[PDB]
């Protein structure tokens, strides 16, 4: 059962392996919103993402791909390529990425921690059902965080 909490998703307070999953764009932009909250806590995810994008001519970077970045002994950030362009979230891309998060979280026995991007609007009304279908359906604990 998805938990809804007000908090900073970069600091989950639960036991066991934690995975913080969030939506990135496919253009290499890391400059507004939750990506800044991540860089306020750890430098690794941003460095990883920029390198991943820079080297896309030799690697898996693209819509629906996910990069897992270890930031603490039992904490990982999952940079999901889910958004096409910048100021537009792609349903197939987010679905695929969340499934990949689910695969990795299942093997790590991790819980998953996501910032909220409500169910009455275009974005979250696509995303939350894919959380249910790709994560909850597999028995993976999920917590969704509200913060500015
Ligand atoms: Na919430
Ligand atoms: Na709230």
Author numbering: 3 to 89, 96 to 125, 128 to 158
Question: How do the authors describe this structure?
Answer:
SCO6735 is a 161-amino acid protein with molecular weight of 17.4 kDa that belongs to an uncharacterized subgroup of macrodomain proteins. Macrodomains are ancient folds with high affinity for ADP-ribose binding. Here we determine the structure of SCO6735 and show that this protein hydrolyzes glutamate-linked protein mono-ADP-ribosylation. Furthermore, we show that depletion of SCO6735 leads to a significantly increased production of antibiotic actinorhodin in S. coelicolor.
To better understand the structure-function relationship of SCO6735 hydrolytic activity, we determined a high resolution (1.60 Å) crystal structure of this protein. The structure of SCO6735 revealed highly conserved three-layered α-β-α sandwich macrodomain fold with a deep cleft that, by analogy with other macrodomain proteins, represents a putative ligand-binding site. A central six-stranded β-sheet contains a mixture of five parallel and one anti-parallel strand, and it is surrounded by four α-helices. The most pronounced difference is observed in the phosphate binding loop position. It was previously shown that, as for example in TARG1/C6orf130 protein, in both apo and complexed structures, the phosphate binding loop has the same position and encloses substrate within the active site. Surprisingly, in SCO6735 this loop is located far away (∼15 Å) from the binding cleft. Two amino acids from this loop, Gly126 and Cys127, which were not well defined in the electron density maps, are omitted. To check that the position of the phosphate binding loop in our structure is not a consequence of crystal packing, we carefully checked all contacts between amino acids composing the phosphate binding loop and surrounding symmetry equivalent molecules. We found out that there is only one hydrogen bond (Leu129 N-H … Oδ1B Asp156). A structural comparison shows that the catalytic residues of TARG1 (Lys84 and Asp125) are not conserved in SCO6735 and BT1257 (replaced by Gln and Ala, respectively), additionally confirming that these proteins utilize different catalytic mechanism. Up to now we were not able to obtain the SCO6735 structure with bound ADP-ribose.
